[PDB]
Amino acid sequence: SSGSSYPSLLQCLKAPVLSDSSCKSSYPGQITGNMICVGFLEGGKDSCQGDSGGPVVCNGQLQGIVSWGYGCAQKNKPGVYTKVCNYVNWIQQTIAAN
**Contact footprint for other proteins (CB under 8 A):** 1-3, 5-20, 30, 32, 34-36, 38, 44-68, 72-73, 79-80, 82-85, 87-88, 90-92, 94-95, 98
Out of 1, 21, 52, 67, the active site residue is: 52
Q: Please tell me the distance from the alpha carbon of residue 77 to that of residue 71, in angstroms, as a whole number.
A: 8
Residue 78: name the closest of 44, 41, 52 by CA. 41
Q: Please tell me the distance from the alpha carbon of residue 30 to that of residue 77, in angstroms, as a whole number.
A: 12
- Contacts (Cβ under 8 Å, ≥6 apart) of 72: 46, 47, 48, 49
Does 52 participate in catalysis according to the annotation?
Answer: yes
The number of residues in the chain equals 98
In the complex with other proteins, which residue's Cβ is closer, 19 or 25? 19
**CB of 41 vs other proteins, minimal distance in Å:** 12
Q: What residue type is assigned to position 24 of the chain?
A: K
In the complex with other proteins, which residue's Cβ is closer, 19 or 76? 19
**CB of 82 vs other proteins, minimal distance in Å:** 5
Query: Which of the residues are catalytic?
Result: 52
